[PDB]
Amino acid sequence: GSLVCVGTGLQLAGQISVLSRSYIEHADIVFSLLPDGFSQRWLTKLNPNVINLQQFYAQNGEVKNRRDTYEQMVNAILDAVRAGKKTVCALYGHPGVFACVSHMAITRAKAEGFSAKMEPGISAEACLWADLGIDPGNSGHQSFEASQFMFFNHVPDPTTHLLLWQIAIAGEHTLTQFHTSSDRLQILVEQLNQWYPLDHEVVIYEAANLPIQAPRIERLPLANLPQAHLMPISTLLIPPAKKLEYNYAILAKLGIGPEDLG
Amino acid sequence: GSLVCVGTGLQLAGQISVLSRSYIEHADIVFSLLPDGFSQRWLTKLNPNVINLQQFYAQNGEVKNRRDTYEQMVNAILDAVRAGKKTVCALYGHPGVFACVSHMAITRAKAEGFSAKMEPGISAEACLWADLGIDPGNSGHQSFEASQFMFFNHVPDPTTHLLLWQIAIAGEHTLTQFHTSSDRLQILVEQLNQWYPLDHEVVIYEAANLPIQAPRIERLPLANLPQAHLMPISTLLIPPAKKLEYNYAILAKLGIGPEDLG
Amino acid sequence: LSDFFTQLGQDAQLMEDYKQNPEAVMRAHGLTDEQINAVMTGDMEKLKTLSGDSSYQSYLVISHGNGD
Amino acid sequence: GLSDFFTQLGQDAQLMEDYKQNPEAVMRAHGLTDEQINAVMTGDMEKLKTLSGDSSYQSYLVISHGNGD
């Protein structure tokens, strides 16, 4: 048995890499986590032996800690590998970006003596740079899980493009609900106000999943975030609040100044 | 005319999107910037009408500002679009990540009334998360261009994974040399020592371009960086210097403590 | 619907035909007036209705921010 | 022959998993010479590019800078 984790990207059918599609094609069994029924149909046509990982999420109002959901997904994948199957895990996006299940399964498979690897894919953030016409290198980039930004000590650089992922569950500390409350988002606004003014224009971004669909690109002042409509897939982009300023200390040690820059 | 910019990923032939490959196939003309001659042959077999953008880099020891190279690349692309050609720009990696030519070409094409768009691809950072088994969501992620970090004021968060791209030209202010010097990299080491100890283990990463090739994953103390062998494609990964610590301030506003986290 | 969306997503030729004339390309591939209307108004939910889904439970959160 | 094998290997998951089982057997079966195989097993990419005829393809992959506006 062996494990290969691949990503399918965000867009139906065409955003998977050529090699990643061939892995799906030739698998004994595929464990999937895909955005919708169109994507599920496409996968099933590629390889009919599919187990849908969506089944491990809380059903019908059940209280279930997402740590248990993830543990159950990893165990299901590993049960196929342990049985001797040439196993592929097909996740949306990139299988290792804001996605613990593939890293955990690869770690556990290697510890038990099996071959396991991860193929890169196109993430929501890769889609954002394209759709918004922004280069993360322009003034640099920072990414955090929104709840981690609230629960732990993180300090953003306000010259960079800042991304808060999983904004729809910001501050949802139990890992048992699917969305947060407006009061939690208000606290996040107050926290960000250490670096960003309340009227600072931010962007709610959602990558499209169908070829006929435009991405969501909603611009609004930071103050209005707690009233906005958010979905689990939403990401909050916070553009720079200041422009790049010259680092005179280092320029001197280098023996140059601004006027010397090419 | 029209313009679509695509990426080809880092690995030969297999890391391009299904859709992006289709765009190359059906183009009237392709402008390429690819890692090697194997990749160039693969492209030429896909579509024989190729112009190689590599020609616009300084040749034979010429002194040329890279801003002029990039202008010349943008102008070549636009001349095909202005003539009426269905034009594709095929760059390695992701065409808009640490890559200015495509964003500039798309801005210019739209301003002159032509249809232009960017298709996301797999970047070197996407390859790093897969190859190192790191999730940027684990403790967060920051990316900066190394020279920008030296020349302007950026402040890293030492709980995150920090990436300095283009480390091989760190401090090269003229934009006319292909590599920096040992003394510049010593200054970077001294700068980073504000946040990271000199014996802090850092990683030099290079994504593989051929399927028979292993990525470069070189671990070394930060102090040894100025003696390391670096290539234009090298990235410096600086793992966290500190563990995550609880944000008691925000937990208190949310009415919870650490013991309440799921 | 599903066959059309799968082809369109992979085939740059059809994608460029579609972007030139969305309604013509959709009619040629048999989409109904109601489906086309749902596309033109951005109503992804109704599209999934018309495809017949049983509203496929699709939560796609694969990480958390609580550490450990 | 080199370039043909690498293009196939990079796209085809069946050949990739064969290759990873037995790299030397798969390279021999696709005709690579002993010196090519040696170059692969020692990680010498420059020699592979010599042996392919690519010699002096000028590849500089920097498409951005840190100097601002």
Residue numbers in the entry:
A (entry chain C), B (entry chain A): 2 to 263
C (entry chain D): 4 to 71
D (entry chain B): 3 to 71
Pull text from the paper.
Here we report the discovery of type IV borosin natural product pathways (termed ‘split borosins’), featuring an iteratively acting α-N-methyltransferase and separate precursor peptide substrate from the metal-respiring bacterium Shewanella oneidensis. The α-N-methyltransferase SonM from Shewanella oneidensis MR-1 iteratively methylates its substrate SonA at two residues, SonA-L63 and SonA-I65, in an N-to-C terminal fashion on the core peptide. Complexes of SonM and SonA form dimers of heterodimers.
Most differences between the structures relate to concerted rotamer changes due to steric hindrance upon SAH binding. Specifically, upon SAH binding, the side chain of SonM-Y93 relocates by 1 Å and the side chain of SonM-I234 rotates nearly 180° to increase the cofactor binding pocket volume. Interestingly, changes in SonM-Y93 conformation induces a conformation change (up to 1.8 Å) of the side chain of i−2 SonA-MLE63. These changes appear necessary to sterically allow for cofactor exchange. We therefore find that SonM can adopt a closed conformation in the absence of the core peptide and with cofactor (SAM) bound, and also in the absence of cofactor with the core peptide bound.
